[PDB]
Design an enzyme around this catalytic site. Structure first.
Site, PDB file in Angstrom:
ATOM      1  N   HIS C 122      20.471   4.806 -12.663  1.00  0.00           N
ATOM      2  CA  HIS C 122      19.535   3.695 -12.520  1.00  0.00           C
ATOM      3  C   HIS C 122      18.136   4.024 -13.035  1.00  0.00           C
ATOM      4  CE1 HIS C 122      22.567   1.635 -10.101  1.00  0.00           C
ATOM      5  NE2 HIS C 122      22.711   2.760  -9.425  1.00  0.00           N
ATOM      6  N   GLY C 123      18.002   4.992 -13.937  1.00  0.00           N
ATOM      7  CA  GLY C 123      16.696   5.337 -14.456  1.00  0.00           C
ATOM      8  C   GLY C 123      15.840   6.169 -13.530  1.00  0.00           C
TER       9      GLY C 123
END
Ligand SMILES: CCCCCCCCCCCCCCCCCC(=O)OC[C@H](COP(=O)([O-])OCC(O)COP(=O)([O-])OC[C@@H](COC(=O)CCCCCCCCCCCCCCCCC)OC(=O)CCCCCCCCCCCCCCCCC)OC(=O)CCCCCCCCCCCCCCCCC
Ligand SMILES: CCCCCCCCCCCCCCCCCC(=O)OC[C@H](COP(=O)([O-])OCC(O)COP(=O)([O-])OC[C@@H](COC(=O)CCCCCCCCCCCCCCCCC)OC(=O)CCCCCCCCCCCCCCCCC)OC(=O)CCCCCCCCCCCCCCCCC
Ligand SMILES: CCCCCCCCCCCCCCCCCC(=O)OC[C@H](COP(=O)(O)O)OC(=O)CCCCCCCCCCCCCCCCC
Ligand SMILES: CCCCCCCCCCCCCCCCCC(=O)OC[C@H](COP(=O)(O)O)OC(=O)CCCCCCCCCCCCCCCCC
Ligand code: HEC
Ligand code: HEC
Ligand code: HEC
Ligand code: HEC
Ligand SMILES: COC1=C(OC)C(=O)C(C/C=C(\C)CC/C=C(/C)CC/C=C(\C)CC/C=C(\C)CCC=C(C)C)=C(C)C1=O
Ligand SMILES: COC1=C(OC)C(=O)C(C/C=C(\C)CC/C=C(/C)CC/C=C(\C)CC/C=C(\C)CCC=C(C)C)=C(C)C1=O
Ligand SMILES: COC1=C(OC)C(=O)C(C/C=C(\C)CC/C=C(/C)CC/C=C(\C)CC/C=C(\C)CCC=C(C)C)=C(C)C1=O
Ligand SMILES: COC1=C(OC)C(=O)C(C/C=C(\C)CC/C=C(\C)CC/C=C(\C)CC/C=C(/C)CCC=C(C)C)=C(C)C1=O
Lengths: 70, 59, 157, 48, 243, 376, 376, 53
Positions: C122-123
């Site tokens: 998710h970054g």
């Protein structure tokens, strides 16, 4: 639900107006003797047939084992 | 002949919401007593054979 | 009737607890929660991954430049502020569990803009010290319980 | 027409609602489930 | 055939036979020492781990010191190779052979079986094991034994490939117990009987509690049955029928 | 009559041959028989599959591969069982949307709707834990992400999580218990389906007109057997296309990689039929609030017979609002397969807010306004 | 009144709470509730054991051992399952012998007897394939000996044998398919039991007097719930004794050896509850004739409600011959556990002939003579 | 080897594969085409697409 024609008077007492297990000690030997009087013949013929055929079979098996010896 | 008391009936028996917690605490104490009796009988009978007897013997 | 219901409640509770405590962790599962790692086979500047309770734990022999860069990180930039001295007793040897507190992913060592750990799910972004830098991960990476052994060993647990 | 339709039509008055005694007798079941859960789990002296 | 069946073993007065009786845990400890020094040269016990001996047979530190004296293959390392290490509590008991075929090759073709479940895996388990270990007798007339085999009338067929292994004084017990062949055999039979049923004491304690609870509940349920059926068992029916 | 002398033949006759059904039912009343056919197909294919599957780590992937390449007709069985879950969810979703459109859960059919919602929850759990079984990357990481969401309940968190896992991470005990739970749950599905059908037969079905249809009823077993057979043949055509021509179209390529607990994939998304709940969960920036919103959706589904006013046509405002609701749900399904982005977070939040607004504000209040307009 | 508003309350009330039942039922009428409770116990403990068992020939025995030692409460579950199978067969056999003694299969209860015989056949198959799952020596070799009876059928015998095995011998595919079939067949048993019980509720039970009892009926729930609880507690005592004090009493020691296809045991015997069928098979020196004799035994069991005359206490000649039949079936049970020997072959042949004589000659003809004696 | 034998492996385990290739595991190529998004196109482009940064 299956109407049954019948003429009777039925009486019933509350379960909190009588005893629960006190008569069970009085009737226990009589019920034991009554059970064995009612089922005596069947239990006896079962026992005679089962144990007699088992005993005859085990005896002849032992004789078969003895016949194989030198 | 023998009959449950009225004052003891009005407290612990008339409502189920009072009867059930009393039932649970009685169940707890009954389990504790049965555990105690079984464990005491087993440890008394088999004394000297358990592992804890050997460990306490080696102290 | 109350006396019988005492034993009825006891038997019901005992049976329910015996059924439930069969999905609990088995004895060989419990025995495999311990780990000893030799640090003599660790090179400097290299991250090794070990299986501690199925969780990938990143052990990186941190260089002095990496130690200085982790000490130069201000707590204001960290979303969850924690100093580098508050995580590892020895700044050279870092023991960090690589599980995201966001959902449960695994970061990648040697990748990221901060020369640290980058989470691809998710970054989420992490530095060289296990502190959140960018992304939806709200909490820092956990440091497990471990102690130093005289023979250059670390026992986790 | 059981639910919000009963209250839109005016069928839920101050009457036909449960009394305070009825709600207290129903509300007394809250302690039973708490005691049952504490009996099942047994976290003794866990209250802080 | 009688010779194929083998000689039956007598019933010995084991101290753990009754449902109220526990194991003799001092005999389990002495039985494990017979296992390490005589049995384990050719028997595996592959379902035992050192963790299970703790609290039954040894303390934690004694079992750790016993496990640390064994060499356990582990790996692979970071270079993709197999290495060895000290055994730990979670490790299983060492097997003397890597596979069944080398075990057969070391013993004339016969495979010495695993002893974790040999007590529950034989009819009349502990008695057969004790009588087999102490029962290497002279063969009867007309029975010849080939080379590599030894006579034992408790083994079915009478020709076993296991030689006499228990000798007087061949184990030095640490509690001062004198180690004759019969004492060694009794102790290793006790250890193997524990290995087949490791939770027999806990099972018996739970069974005693369950039997007591169910026996009380039978009386309470009979009481509640007779209370409900009382207005029917004592009812009065009067009718005009005489017959 | 021959059926009047054996009680089995009497029940079968009464509920499958002579059952009075409205004569104006269109082809949107074939959802239930198709759902039952898909349930039976899934049960048959899975029972056949379980004779070649081994529910252990380090054997599961290889057993699925041996099933695919070495078992005669094994590839057909696996692809049929995989795509049948998708078709089962397509049919059940269209069934639920039919019931939403016509107000089918209203009095006196509230038990039918409630038992349907229970069936849907059991279907979701069954499909998820069955998706874990092949033990690929998507299986492992989806099971990790979903089961490690019990750390949102305060205090009693990781205790429940570790009891579910049988350990400290998703491993062999989790897979081994998931096999047993997945084998067992479809029989509960079949029993709940039998109870659900038996609850409908108390009052019979609604009709597209939305009026009382007691005057115009015909026998089920002659007229609605061939009508169900036509839709079953359409479903068999779609099923055969999916199995034989596009077997991996609806899947994920990452599930063909063996599971690695130390390396995670770039994008972790579930199967398509779980995507709307995933978008609702992923849009809210709080785990406990996301689980609360997911629970609130199903609570509002249970409360629908007691708050929902308004049916099909002749109630035109709620009829028009149904299409906005359908667009909202399909948008949430599309958003779940994307990455987390501020615009997608904002759009998912707006979609979740409108979903709750329609389920809890439009259905009672607009329905009451429609009743006041029509019969006031 | 409250059960009049919901269907599920009404069905439960009618068939469990207010169901009329003869007031003079004795404790021989408790076998059905005990059999249902034992089926529920088997299903629960089996579902719990399936979370730790692995159906592969390299891991089956090892997972059984690991479940025994390392899984918390795993020994209780495993012993409970293995001995609950034997108690299930005890309760069902006593139930069938009650029906044989009282002639309970007669009109109008032919469907109840026929569904019972179907249940018993499914039970036998379920237990037989469950015994193969530990993959011990008895588990392997009994499956080898029994599934080799298919070659008695000419022409297509070996083909059916190889189709059931999945190969040229009993091996891993046999174990995997046996595990799937074994998980599946108890749910068919639950469905069959529901049908069997609902067939009996059409007319009610018979009473120990053997007369019509419609004048003296009492509610089931208030009265026979406690009477069933008493028998359930007596069964729980025996269950506790068998689980905790004598866990391998009803087992075999050879099933604790791992399976070896190159060394058979000296005495391959089944569990005790299949020993009478095994004695019938071993007594006849022809495989086809033995299989036919077993099939004829079960055909005579199916044909009991249509050829059987003669019931309870007041029909005294058949009541006396019942005990001879009971001694015969227990002699068949004992003979199955013994080795092949000329005297055991002769005695088994005579015992099988007497079983056929009692089933096909005594029950019609002696029943007709005693009906002519009593009412001619 | 015979017909029932599998295809031979270049190494003995994953760790030797990482050791012989600088800490990177060359993945198994049996299901690699179905294992990647847009499989055969991606494999062809990757095989012929070593260009300058
Ligand atoms: C011991 C020797 C073994 C051989 C003999 C077996 C028993 C002898 C009698 C046989 C008999 O007829 O049994 C019924 C017999 C009397 O029957 P009955 O009154 O004629 O008819 C009632 C029905 O037959 C029975 O129907 P019911 O439902 O009304 O009665 C239920 C209950 C009757 O309820 C009772 O009274 C039984 C109480 C159980 C004792 C548990 C105590 C532990 C906990 C105490 C808690 C109790 C709470 C109450 C407290 C309040 C008291 C004020 O009976 C039982 O379930 C108990 C077992 C009865 C026989 C089962 C075994 C038969 C096969 C033999 C195998 C042995 C080999 O009851 C008993 O056996 C109980 C009395 C104890 C007998 C001991 C000797 C007395 C002198
Ligand atoms: C084993 C299954 C049979 C248990 C029979 C249920 C029963 O009446 O409770 C006895 C018994 C309760 O002990 P109790 O204090 O002697 O009986 C309560 C009063 O004597 C008398 O209580 P009651 O007359 O109010 O009992 C009516 C009964 C409702 O009874 C029924 O409608 C029975 C329906 C199922 C019959 C199962 C036969 C197999 O509802 C309950 O209070 C118990 C509901 C649980 C079923 O059930 C248990 O909880 C024992 C364990 C059974 C599980
Ligand atoms: C060689 C090998 C030696 C083996 C030695 C051990 C054999 C088994 C142990 C001894 C068994 C004998 C006594 C068994 C008593 C059991 C109880 C019992 O019967 O009561 C039930 C029963 C109880 O009735 P209830 O109390 O009404 O239920 O008692 C009876 O009705 C009496 C039964 C008598 C019938 C069996 C008599 C023994 C059969 C021997 C037949 C020998 C044939 C020889 C032919 C060849 C000659 C060359
Ligand atoms: C506030 C009161 C609420 C009611 C509580 C009633 C509790 C007793 C009821 C009862 O049944 O009594 C009436 C009745 C006699 O009443 P009486 O008229 O005062 O004699 O007693 C019994 O039936 C016996 C009860 C047996 C105990 C069951 C519950 C306790 C479990 C512990 C069992 C003993 C430990 C193990 C020892 C093994 C041998 C060494
Ligand atoms: C007789 C009826 C019977 C029923 C009903 C039954 N089983 Fe069993 N099951 C057995 C027998 C016999 C065994 C062999 C036990 C043994 O000897 O170890 C067994 C063993 C097993 C085993 C292997 C584990 C072991 O201890 O050997 C599993 C798994 C299993 N059963 C699952 C189930 C499941 C799941 C269900 C129901 C949904 C079920 N069983 C119902 C008879 C039954
Ligand atoms: C959340 C709601 C819901 C779910 C999920 C659901 N049902 Fe339905 N079902 C209904 C309702 C409401 C009706 C009544 C429709 C009407 O008569 O207007 C219905 C009707 C039916 C019918 C009668 C024919 C028809 O389609 O109208 C069948 C058959 C049926 N359901 C079977 C099933 C099966 C099988 C499943 C799942 C495996 C299922 N249903 C899932 C709510 C549901
Ligand atoms: C509601 C959906 C659903 C139902 C009903 C269902 N399954 Fe499946 N099951 C799945 C899904 C999805 C998978 C994952 C398949 C895949 O991706 O390979 C699966 C996988 C499996 C697997 C693993 C092998 C494989 O190819 O994945 C087995 C075995 C299995 N199911 C058996 C069963 C059995 C047995 C039943 C019923 C008695 C059943 N299933 C019913 C959805 C379902
Ligand atoms: C081959 C015969 C047979 C088998 C096997 C059998 N039943 Fe019965 N059962 C009967 C008959 C006949 C009756 C009716 C007897 C009567 O009411 O007098 C009956 C009656 C019953 C009753 C009502 C009360 C009673 O105990 O008589 C129940 C409950 C019941 N059966 C359940 C079961 C269950 C559960 C099983 C097995 C899982 C089973 N039965 C197996 C023949 C059988
Ligand atoms: C990529 O990741 C993801 C997945 O993965 C592929 C998913 O699937 C899902 C979809 C799952 C959702 C929405 C939740 C599923 C529902 C529940 C209740 C969780 C499942 C619960 C379990 C496994 C607890 C254990 C219980 C079992 C096995 C059965 C219980 C028994 C009975 C009820 C009788 C999402 C969102 C996801 O993002
Ligand atoms: C007068 O005569 C009668 C009796 O005799 C005295 C009876 O006793 C009974 C009551 C019957 C009983 C107790 C027998 C039990 C019934 C059946 C059908 C047994 C099979 C059912 C099983 C195994 C249920 C287990 C399965 C479940 C719960 C589904 C799986 C789902 C989950 C685990 C969530 C009745 C009605 C009767 O009239
Ligand atoms: C230790 O071992 C042994 C057993 O075991 C415990 C035995 O029982 C038996 C003997 C048992 C007999 C004669 C009665 C049971 C007989 C049969 C034939 C059982 C039925 C099972 C069959 C035919 C296996 C095939 C399985 C099928 C068809 C699965 C069911 C699925 C469907 C119908 C779709 C013996 C000798 C044995 O030594
Ligand atoms: C509004 O009007 C209605 C409809 O709309 C026109 C319907 O559609 C239906 C229901 C339709 C039914 C019941 C038929 C669809 C099939 C179902 C639910 C099950 C599918 C099963 C199949 C294809 C075969 C299964 C075979 C076997 C052997 C399994 C059984 C197992 C054993 C015997 C052991 C109803 C009641 C209705 O009122």
């Amino acid at each position: 639900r299956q109407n049954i024609p019948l003429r009777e008077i039925l009486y019933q007492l509350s379960p909190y107006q009588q005893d629960v297990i006190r008569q069970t000690f009085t009737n226990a030997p009589k019920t034991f003797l009554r059970f064995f009087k009612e089922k005596g013949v069947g239990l006896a013929t079962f026992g005679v047939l089962f144990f007699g055929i088992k005993g005859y079979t085990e005896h002849e098996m032992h004789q078969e084992r003895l016949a194989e010896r030198y | 002949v023998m009959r449950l008391s009225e004052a003891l009936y009005q407290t612990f028996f008339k409502r189920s919401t009072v009867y059930i917690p009393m039932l649970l605490v009685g169940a707890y104490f009954s389990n504790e007593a049965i555990d105690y009796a079984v464990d005491k009988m087993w440890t008394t009978r088999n004394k000297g054979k358990l592992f804890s007897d050997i460990i306490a013997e080696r102290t | 009737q109350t006396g019988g219901r005492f034993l009825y409640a006891s038997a019901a509770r005992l049976a329910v607890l015996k059924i439930v405590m069969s999905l609990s962790a088995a004895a060989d599962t419990m025995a495999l929660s311990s780990l000893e790692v030799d640090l003599s086979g660790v090179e400097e500047g290299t991250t090794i991954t070990v299986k501690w309770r199925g969780k990938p734990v990143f052990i990186r022999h941190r260089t002095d430049a990496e130690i200085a860069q982790s000490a130069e990180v201000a707590l204001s930039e960290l979303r969850d502020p924690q100093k580098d001295v508050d995580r590892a007793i020895n700044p050279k040897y870092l023991v960090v569990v690589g599980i995201c507190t966001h959902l449960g992913c695994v970061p990648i060592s040697g990748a990221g803009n901060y020369q640290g750990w980058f989470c691809p799910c998710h970054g989420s972004h992490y530095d060289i010290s296990g502190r959140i830098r960018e992304g939806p991960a709200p909490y820092n990476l956990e440091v497990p319980e471990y102690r130093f052994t005289e023979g250059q060993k670390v026992v986790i647990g | 027409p059981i639910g919000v339709w009963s209250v839109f039509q005016g069928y839920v008055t101050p009457a036909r609602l449960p009394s305070i005694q009825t709600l207290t007798r129903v509300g007394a079941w809250g302690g039973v489930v708490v005691v049952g859960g504490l009996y099942m789990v047994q976290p003794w002296d866990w209250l802080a | 055939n009688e010779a194929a069946d083998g000689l039956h073993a007598p019933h010995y007065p084991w101290g753990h036979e009754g449902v109220l009786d526990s194991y003799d845990h001092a005999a389990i400890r002495r039985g494990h020492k017979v296992y390490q020094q005589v049995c384990a040269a050719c028997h595996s016990m592959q379902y035992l781990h050192w963790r299970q001996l703790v609290g039954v047979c040894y303390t934690e530190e004694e079992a750790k010191a016993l496990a640390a004296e064994t060499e356990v293959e582990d790996g692979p390392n970071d270079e993709g190779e197999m290495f060895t290490r000290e055994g730990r509590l979670f490790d299983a008991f060492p097997s003397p052979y890597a596979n069944e075929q080398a075990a057969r090759y070391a013993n004339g073709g016969a495979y010495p079986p695993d002893l974790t479940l040999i007590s529950g895996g034989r009819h009349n388990g502990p008695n057969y094991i004790f009588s087999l270990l102490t029962g290497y007798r002279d063969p009867p007339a007309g029975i010849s034994i080939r080379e590599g085999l030894y006579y034992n009338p408790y083994f079915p067929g009478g020709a076993i490939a296991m030689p006499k292994m228990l000798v007087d004084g061949g184990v030095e017990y640490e509690d001062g117990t004198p180690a004759s062949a019969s004492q060694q055999a009794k102790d290793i039979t006790t250890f193997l009987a524990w290995a087949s049923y490791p939770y027999q004491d806990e099972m018996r304690v739970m069974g005693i509690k369950a039997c007591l609870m169910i026996s009380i509940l039978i009386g309470f349920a009979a009481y509640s049955k007779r209370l409900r059926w009382a207005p029917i068992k004592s009812q009065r029916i009067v009718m005009d029928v005489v017959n | 009559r021959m059926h009047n002398k054996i009680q089995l033949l009497s029940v079968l006759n009464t509920h499958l041959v002579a059952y009075p059904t409205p004569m104006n039912l269109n082809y949107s009343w074939n959802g239930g028989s198709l759902a039952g056919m898909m349930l039976a197909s899934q049960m048959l294919t899975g029972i056949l599959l379980a004779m070649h599957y081994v529910g252990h780590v380090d054997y599961a992937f290889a057993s699925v591969q041996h099933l695919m390449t070495d078992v005669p007709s094994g590839m057909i069985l696996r692809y049929a069982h995989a795509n049948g879950a998708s078709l089962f969810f397509i049919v059940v979703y269209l069934h639920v949307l039919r019931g939403m459109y016509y107000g089918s859960g209203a009095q006196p059919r509230e038990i039918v709707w409630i038992s349907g919602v229970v069936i849907l929850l059991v279907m979701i759990i069954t499909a998820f834990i069955g998706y874990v079984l092949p033990w690929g990357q998507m299986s492992f990481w989806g099971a990790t992400v979903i089961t490690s969401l019990a750390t949102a309940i305060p205090v009693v968190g990781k205790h429940i999580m570790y009891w579910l896992w049988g350990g400290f991470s998703v491993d062999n005990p989790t897979l081994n218990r998931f096999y047993s739970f997945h084998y067992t749950l479809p029989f509960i599905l079949a029993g709940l389906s039998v109870f659900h059908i038996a609850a409908l037969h108390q009052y019979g079905s609604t009709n597209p007109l939305g009026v009382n249809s007691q005057s115009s009823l015909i026998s089920f077993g002659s007229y609605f057997g061939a009508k169900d057979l036509v839709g079953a043949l359409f479903l068999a055509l779609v099923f055969s296309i999916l199995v034989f021509f596009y077997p991996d179209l609806l899947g994920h390529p990452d599930n063909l990689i063996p599971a690695n607990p130390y390396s995670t994939p770039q994008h972790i998304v579930p199967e398509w039929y779980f995507l709307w709940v995933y978008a609702i969960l992923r849009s809210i920036p709080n785990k406990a609030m996301g689980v609360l919103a997911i629970g609130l959706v199903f609570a509002s589904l249970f409360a629908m017979p007691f708050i929902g006013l308004g049916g099909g046509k002749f109630r035109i405002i709620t009829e028009w609002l149904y299409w906005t609701f359908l667009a909202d749900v399909l948008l949430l399904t599309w958003l779940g397969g994307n990455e987390i982005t501020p615009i997608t977070s904002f759009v998912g939040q707006c979609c979740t807010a409108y979903l709750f607004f329609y389920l809890l504000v439009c259905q009672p209040l607009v329905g009451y306004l429609e009743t006041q307009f029509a019969h006031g």
